[PDB]
Amino acid sequence: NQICLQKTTSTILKPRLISYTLPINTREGVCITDPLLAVDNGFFAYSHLEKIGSCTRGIAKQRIIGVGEVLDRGDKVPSMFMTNVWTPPNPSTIHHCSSTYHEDFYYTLCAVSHVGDPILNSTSWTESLSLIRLAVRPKSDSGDYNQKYIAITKVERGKYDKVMPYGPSGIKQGDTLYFPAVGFLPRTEFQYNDSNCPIIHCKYSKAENCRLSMGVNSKSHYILRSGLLKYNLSLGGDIILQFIEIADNRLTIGSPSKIYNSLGQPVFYQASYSWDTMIKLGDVDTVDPLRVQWRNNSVISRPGQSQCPRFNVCPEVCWEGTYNDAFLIDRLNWVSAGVYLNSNQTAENPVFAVFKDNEILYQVPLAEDDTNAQKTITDCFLLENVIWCISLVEIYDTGDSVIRPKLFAVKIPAQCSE
Amino acid sequence: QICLQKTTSTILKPRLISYTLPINTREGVCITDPLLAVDNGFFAYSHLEKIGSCTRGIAKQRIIGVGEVLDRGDKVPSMFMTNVWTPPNPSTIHHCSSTYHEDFYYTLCAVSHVGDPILNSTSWTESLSLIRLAVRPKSDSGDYNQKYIAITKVERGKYDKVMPYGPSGIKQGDTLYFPAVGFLPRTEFQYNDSNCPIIHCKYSKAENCRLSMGVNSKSHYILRSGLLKYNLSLGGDIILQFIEIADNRLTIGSPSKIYNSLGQPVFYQASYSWDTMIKLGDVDTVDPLRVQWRNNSVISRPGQSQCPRFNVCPEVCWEGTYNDAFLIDRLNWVSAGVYLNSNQTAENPVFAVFKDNEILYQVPLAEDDTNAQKTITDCFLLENVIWCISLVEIYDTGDSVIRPKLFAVKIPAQCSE
């Protein structure tokens, strides 16, 4: 169905807090973090890590991976009902979970670590991946159907030393699952020409900077490269993953990414964790090998820090930024919808926006002006005739005894008045 | 089989039950006026969310919810909400009661624009309504998932007003029975003062039983507990019929609960007056309602100055707390529920398993000085093990969000270990 395509300052966006169920807790002094949200085919996947104390550095208490239905509550407004919850024995070992819906199940692929975040301790992390398959509609007195845990032995990684899921959600093509992922490649093996680093209109940029900034720091062992992890269900036996590296068009440090189907075709978002701060988003040209037709988008960036702030395009050695994805809602006019932090060098001020490449059509703040915020994950879908979007937004520093993200439901307007 | 010996061993091991609800939108919030029903592998739940104080705060959201009680995987019960209803105005819905029948929970509530009808009886113009929620919603149906019915036809006998007054009721065939209360004018109230048992009570007057049948001694109406009957076999008119409880061991109308256990119906009525010992027993007849109260002598409830725990002398008092119990063995008449172990303050919740004249085994749920009010227990079989779920109102040390805690307790077979 149609949507509003005119640039207007009218209050036609009316964000509401969505009703969603989870295992209800009464523990104080807790931070809910490392969120994941996937919405596909009338079902959803959700995850978090509960920490006691600090969000960044508290003692890990509970990890949950959960799935359920996204339903019409009665008055043509979406709700969410959890149906199946999985919990590991040790909360601190599960990292970088990514989820993909196929049939009956949400197949979630996580990394396993005893050295913390593999990104921050790459050389130490011995590569271990595993898959939690949860059924979106549990059946009593079945076997493996409801919950099944699989340790991945067979991993096909090309020329990369290590590979890992790196993103919230992926897609299905037939019976082949594609998770967003990243490859770890030694700097010395990294094939790259310094002449291709666009420093030509940048007085204080060096040719070396693009290459140097392909790692988490300038003297890091590995470089990171985004990609897909492929999992073909048609071979119904031993589980075998194949890594696919992203094309080098507009290349940037491997960063959390998302692949999703919208209006029949696949679309890619990659976070801008470096100097190329403008939003990276576009239709998938080919999936294997992965190649994106990045939009020449000129109005959506992300907050940085001193070295690589918002709207930066000059190559610099920096690892900073925040994942703030967007969802294509109209391909003919290429309009998307997502939440961006309206701030240059601090993670603040979340704003839900609907935008073309060179224009924000209409928007609305979700919190105040001085409200702290990090990750934002948006997924959009039809509920009968009407396009709806669900957005999980990390909101911190609030003073709550329990810091947890807030989930918004937004109706996209058809008319441009009112 | 269950353990039938009086034991001090730690054979009860309460655990926090996993249950899902819509996450709250904020803090500085109190979750109150709870309801919990468990029946036929499904559950019904309700609360009112207030901003600020529990008794004084700003009403923000009312939810009525239903869902499945499932085996999570390791033979331990879990709860999954499936269907949630919310009124436009949170402050108008009062005294909800729930009963399950064929795919639906039917909850029955008071509609008031004057607050709690109990505290504003003369002002409350009698309005009742029914929210029917499906325990397993189906997409692209009509009324099936949620249906709201305003009750017009009410048959109340000689009572001026009637109202649901309790968390849950039972089904018999296609006839639903909610716990309820009738409002009767004092002047119309037929009662002989000679039947007031003051004979072993130096400082009790004959008038006191009658006077204490109202919320205060000069109140317009008296309250009398009972059932509201709703027969589904007739279409065309949602008529409710009120049934007054029998006058055996009569006491001020107070929140009550009717439930089936081991094939037969059982009644609990709260002790909101001077007769402070637990009121509980098998239903003799349902219409008219008559209970075979147990001569139970070990379970009471905290009161206040005038009518404390273990009081049996007639006094003019409206005080007490709803703390029900669930029969788990009729042959030996053993029940299970949570009581507040305190004489004159609402404190110290203890899960107990007891005969009429004996507490067999028990365990504290919180500390000794932990504040607590209402407790609702429902028990059921899982694989072949008896389980009990207990919703307990608790107010902890400084807490940002005050909400009740739901416990799951396995009843032991052996008396050792």
Ligand SMILES: *[C@@H]1O[C@H](CO)[C@@H](O)[C@H](O)[C@H]1NC(C)=O
């Ligand atoms: C990184 O790995 C080492 C093992 O060489 C481990 O001892 C150390 O604690 C890890 N650091 C972090 C950030 O946990």
Ligand SMILES: *[C@@H]1O[C@H](CO)[C@@H](O)[C@H](O)[C@H]1NC(C)=O
């Ligand atoms: C998946 O496996 C089947 C059977 O080996 C093969 O025919 C098919 O082409 C594979 N699909 C992809 C896209 O890898």
Ligand SMILES: *[C@@H]1O[C@H](CO)[C@@H](O)[C@H](O)[C@H]1NC(C)=O
């Ligand atoms: C962006 O612009 C470049 C050069 O003008 C072009 O090659 C590319 O296809 C454009 N992308 C889209 C999707 O318009």
Ligand SMILES: *[C@@H]1O[C@H](CO)[C@@H](O)[C@H](O)[C@H]1NC(C)=O
């Ligand atoms: C952010 O940076 C841009 C360009 O560098 C500038 O136009 C804008 O005023 C800055 N915003 C604020 C409010 O600091």
Ligand SMILES: *[C@@H]1O[C@H](CO)[C@@H](O)[C@H](O)[C@H]1NC(C)=O
């Ligand atoms: C309910 O109504 C039906 C239809 O008249 C009747 O057969 C049945 O006995 C009634 N049930 C009760 C318990 O009142």
